Design a protein around this ligand. Sequence first.
Ligand SMILES: *[C@@H]1O[C@H](CO)[C@@H](O[C@@H]2O[C@H](CO)[C@@H](O)[C@H](O)[C@H]2NC(C)=O)[C@H](O)[C@H]1NC(C)=O
Ligand SMILES: *[C@@H]1O[C@H](CO)[C@@H](O[C@@H]2O[C@H](CO)[C@@H](O)[C@H](O)[C@H]2NC(C)=O)[C@H](O)[C@H]1NC(C)=O
Ligand SMILES: *[C@@H]1O[C@H](CO)[C@@H](O[C@@H]2O[C@H](CO)[C@@H](O)[C@H](O)[C@H]2NC(C)=O)[C@H](O)[C@H]1NC(C)=O
Ligand SMILES: *[C@@H]1O[C@H](CO)[C@@H](O[C@@H]2O[C@H](CO)[C@@H](O)[C@H](O)[C@H]2NC(C)=O)[C@H](O)[C@H]1NC(C)=O
Ligand SMILES: *[C@@H]1O[C@H](CO)[C@@H](O[C@@H]2O[C@H](CO)[C@@H](O)[C@H](O)[C@H]2NC(C)=O)[C@H](O)[C@H]1NC(C)=O
Ligand SMILES: *[C@@H]1O[C@H](CO)[C@@H](O)[C@H](O)[C@H]1NC(C)=O
Ligand SMILES: *[C@@H]1O[C@H](CO)[C@@H](O)[C@H](O)[C@H]1NC(C)=O
Ligand SMILES: *[C@@H]1O[C@H](CO)[C@@H](O)[C@H](O)[C@H]1NC(C)=O
Ligand SMILES: *[C@@H]1O[C@H](CO)[C@@H](O)[C@H](O)[C@H]1NC(C)=O
Ligand SMILES: *[C@@H]1O[C@H](CO)[C@@H](O)[C@H](O)[C@H]1NC(C)=O
Lengths: 169, 402, 392
Amino acid sequence: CAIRHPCHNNLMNQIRSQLAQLNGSANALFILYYTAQGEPFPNNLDKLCGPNVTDFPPFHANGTEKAKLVELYRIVVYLGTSLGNITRDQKILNPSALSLHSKLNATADILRGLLSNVLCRLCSKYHVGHVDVTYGPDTSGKDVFQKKKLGCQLLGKYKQIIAVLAQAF
Amino acid sequence: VSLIPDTPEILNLSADFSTSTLYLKWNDRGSVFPHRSNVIWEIKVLRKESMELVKLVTHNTTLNGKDTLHHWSWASDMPLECAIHFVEIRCYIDNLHFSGLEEWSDWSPVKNISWIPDSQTKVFPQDKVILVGSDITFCCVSQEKVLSALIGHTNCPLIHLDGENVAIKIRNISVSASSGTNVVFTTEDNIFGTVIFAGYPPDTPQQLNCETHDLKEIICSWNPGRVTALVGPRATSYTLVESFSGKYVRLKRAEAPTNESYQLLFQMLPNQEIYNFTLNAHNPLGRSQSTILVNITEKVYPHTPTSFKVKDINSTAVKLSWHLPGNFAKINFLCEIEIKKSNSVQEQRNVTIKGVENSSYLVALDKLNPYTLYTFRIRCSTETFWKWSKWSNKKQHLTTEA
Amino acid sequence: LPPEKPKNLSCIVNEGKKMRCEWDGGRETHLETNFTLKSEWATHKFADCKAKRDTPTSCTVDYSTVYFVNIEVWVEAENALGKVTSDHINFDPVYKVKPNPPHNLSVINSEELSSILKLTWTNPSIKSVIILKYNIQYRTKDASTWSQIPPEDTASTRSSFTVQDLKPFTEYVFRIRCMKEDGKGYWSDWSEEASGITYEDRPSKAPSFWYKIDPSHTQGYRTVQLVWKTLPPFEANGKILDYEVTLTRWKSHLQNYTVNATKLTVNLTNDRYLATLTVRNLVGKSDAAVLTIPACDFQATHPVMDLKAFPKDNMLWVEWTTPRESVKKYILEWCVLSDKAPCITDWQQEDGTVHRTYLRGNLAESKCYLITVTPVYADGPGSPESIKAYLK
Ligand SMILES: *[C@@H]1O[C@H](CO)[C@@H](O[C@@H]2O[C@H](CO)[C@@H](O)[C@H](O)[C@H]2NC(C)=O)[C@H](O)[C@H]1NC(C)=O
Ligand SMILES: *[C@@H]1O[C@H](CO)[C@@H](O[C@@H]2O[C@H](CO)[C@@H](O)[C@H](O)[C@H]2NC(C)=O)[C@H](O)[C@H]1NC(C)=O
Ligand SMILES: *[C@@H]1O[C@H](CO)[C@@H](O[C@@H]2O[C@H](CO)[C@@H](O)[C@H](O)[C@H]2NC(C)=O)[C@H](O)[C@H]1NC(C)=O
Ligand SMILES: *[C@@H]1O[C@H](CO)[C@@H](O[C@@H]2O[C@H](CO)[C@@H](O)[C@H](O)[C@H]2NC(C)=O)[C@H](O)[C@H]1NC(C)=O
Ligand SMILES: *[C@@H]1O[C@H](CO)[C@@H](O[C@@H]2O[C@H](CO)[C@@H](O)[C@H](O)[C@H]2NC(C)=O)[C@H](O)[C@H]1NC(C)=O
Ligand SMILES: *[C@@H]1O[C@H](CO)[C@@H](O)[C@H](O)[C@H]1NC(C)=O
Ligand SMILES: *[C@@H]1O[C@H](CO)[C@@H](O)[C@H](O)[C@H]1NC(C)=O
Ligand SMILES: *[C@@H]1O[C@H](CO)[C@@H](O)[C@H](O)[C@H]1NC(C)=O
Ligand SMILES: *[C@@H]1O[C@H](CO)[C@@H](O)[C@H](O)[C@H]1NC(C)=O
Ligand SMILES: *[C@@H]1O[C@H](CO)[C@@H](O)[C@H](O)[C@H]1NC(C)=O
């Protein structure tokens, strides 16, 4: 892992507080997103912004701490990539909104912080050395309506998974 | 006798699914008819199981009894990927030297085109940009029943098509927002929709004038008119081109929080003395332009002097020396030095100074009093009258008295 | 001249903005130096803080601050000859957070209760991340030193607090600041001052009063003069509305008056009477005093002996020997003997136990005052005595 200096010891409480803040910021970001997306979206939320994604890393609550941390690392990597893509798409489509972009940037910063913390913990405790990460395509493009729908569904799934992780850890 | 024209045959038919238009071509058998009789060709465009939507007529004549190809195109109001379209043609010859009756010829054999599904998109068109107030029809092809459709939370009525397809006729659309309005088709368990863009043509850029700070480049700015309501990759792009020389520069819209007025850099060409600019504006809906002719010598705006000192020898009073960047070695200057007394009076005087290289300048004075709480201030102009240069930092360095 | 280690490595984080770290200067070393601050997340570093040459005081950071993530920061200074680095520390930026003061402080009074007050405020946006503890200081309308509230009460995140054991009709000012709960961190600035006011429950113990009578005007008909002092605006507990005095005796008299002023003129008979004075406020249930007016013909009834009044110092101190076993109260009067003009008298009430006191008036110098002491007994006042005394 090429650790420069040993980590702290309160990493568990740190990542718990980070997960709580992530749940809160994710709820707020989802509200802002389905409020600022458009007019036909809030009326048909159950069909447009359903929490169903064709590909998402699963999570096992009954698993061990090491497996839970590995799954959390994979999930936060995927969430960071998808959040960067969605932020780029939203900046391209609607440059007027600013609070949405600020919330997206804050969420990305907190996600990167949690990623660094969990990597530090996993490399200082179990000495995993290296992890396996799979990268995919953009999975959203060439269609404005499909972009919007996929972004809203991804944000809903992210809100659900962060509400689950807040209680899991 | 009864003169019946020969039944024409359709050579080839095609369609452009991008802009939803049809292409028809045929060759009249003029080689058989030697006379130069006038003819008329009528083309009927019938769709959705012989509905006879539109009928056109084209008046032509045989070119000296020869066979030449004629091309005819028409833009359909409904996307070609929504329903089938048939087309047939027939002719009626009218000979001036014929005595018998003349009837209409039989219709050409049927020639239809059907769009085969090659993409996953189900609503047409896709990301179309039209003028505000234009009439457009949206179609949604699918295999299941459609419940309703709505764009501006209106729930407009829907019309039926041949096979399990529906369409909506939205007349006199309204102005769209930064994002296109969603034309969704609520199915039983899914929702398919697209976006439409309604923008205005680019307004003519008014207030097009520009001066120069130095004889090296020109900065010509302007302001747009009415907002086109189009932001993103479809926004307008202004381009300034030169008439005589032909050089052109392009403005960049990278950063989103843009300024109110758009400036533009244009490097000066060696020894022209005459500038005749012509600004261009592009947009997927329209275009505008505006020209202006200025004299770069008289349209000059000097810069404020920086890093100047107030000191001289024990002789007569201070000879100032200011620094002014740029290239003015050919033209002279008219820096008016305003001297102010002890909050009592302020006399005015101006002296001419020839241009020099990119360095400081030199000037002389004449019989200034002792200290008397004197202060200095300079504002340069030019022999050609224009806006005077901005004021610099005031100094009050006094040559020793008594 | 190598610069010494820039030690003492002070650093502070601010809420809503970026952090900044400080250091020590050392000797002048007569050479230009550029301090290069460093950052380290133990996994990835960032840009180095370059201290501006015009004012190289703390730092100029560029990265956003994130909590619950440790970071190692140290100072690096180097002149034209030599290189030396400062020590390293590992701290959490969540502890050095300096919160914002609460805003929109509100104060509302309670009904029928004067000591109990209510204090409501609004917590800042940092209440969701950390636990805030409060420190409230209160003082009266005009005070130099504030009163500290025991910090053991305001030791948790709360939106409202109730103050008690307060005096009625006393305006008070409040202010509050907040910081982290565990005591680690810097205190926030003081909030805006909010005024308040208590209730007006009930007046003081008794509005003491004294009667004045003239001789027989028309064959036994005598005029009585009732006068009383104004209660100061700390015992009346509210604005004075009106005074109410009742009088009844001799099987036939029963009256009540609501005169707004202190002076009222009523003509009574020669028979005795019982006085009872109340002062009604906006609440009610006032207190009542008592006074016994004597009969027609009474003798000296134990006059006062050994009366004295003297200077030394700055106030005429009256004194007398202890009277007989039965004495109710002392109410002495005094006026100045002005030439070619009559005198108007003032008065004040004293308890039965007190035998020496100082008068409270607006006396002047180089004047002669005739102080008369009237001993009040159970069955009417006694024979008074007078004495003259200068001021200076
Ligand atoms: C429309 O045009 C198509 C041509 O694509 C016609 O389909 C032809 O039908 C004849 C006899 O029905 C066949 O011999 C050809 O092989 C078909 N061509 C194909 C499949 O490419 C069709 O008949 C025309 N008319 C209608 C109503 O669809
Ligand atoms: C298309 O609709 C717009 C508004 O929906 C119409 O604009 C109105 O026009 C009337 C008179 O023509 C005005 O009194 C209104 O103030 C206009 N309203 C707005 C919002 O502009 C427009 O006239 C319609 N087009 C046609 C051809 O009728
Ligand atoms: C700039 O030079 C042109 C010469 O080509 C002047 O003439 C204009 O030329 C453009 C060519 O696109 C025409 O569209 C204009 O109608 C012409 N104008 C006239 C008055 O003939 C042009 O006038 C010059 N610019 C200015 C500002 O005078
Ligand atoms: C554009 O500006 C130049 C410079 O001011 C003008 O050139 C001047 O022409 C007058 C003749 O009327 C001469 O007396 C000056 O000496 C010239 N100034 C120079 C050469 O620096 C030129 O005439 C202007 N163009 C027009 C069309 O008026
Ligand atoms: C305190 O009450 C005032 C009303 O008296 C309000 O202050 C507003 O605060 C917001 C955001 O801080 C500003 O945009 C408004 O301009 C303020 N004034 C008004 C009249 O709304 C608000 O209710 C409270 N503010 C705070 C900081 O607690
Ligand atoms: C320096 O250390 C002293 C402790 O003696 C104290 O003033 C503070 O902690 C430090 N101050 C600065 C400005 O670094
Ligand atoms: C600061 O001083 C150092 C001396 O070692 C020099 O190398 C550097 O260029 C100076 N400027 C900055 C911005 O660091
Ligand atoms: C005063 O006495 C009169 C006697 O009838 C009575 O009517 C009135 O209510 C009394 N007022 C008060 C304030 O007690
Ligand atoms: C007289 O009484 C009235 C209330 O009836 C009130 O104005 C005040 O107590 C008195 N007036 C003055 C001038 O003091
Ligand atoms: C004053 O007293 C006399 C008694 O002789 C009588 O007129 C009445 O009681 C009083 N009059 C007034 C106006 O107070």
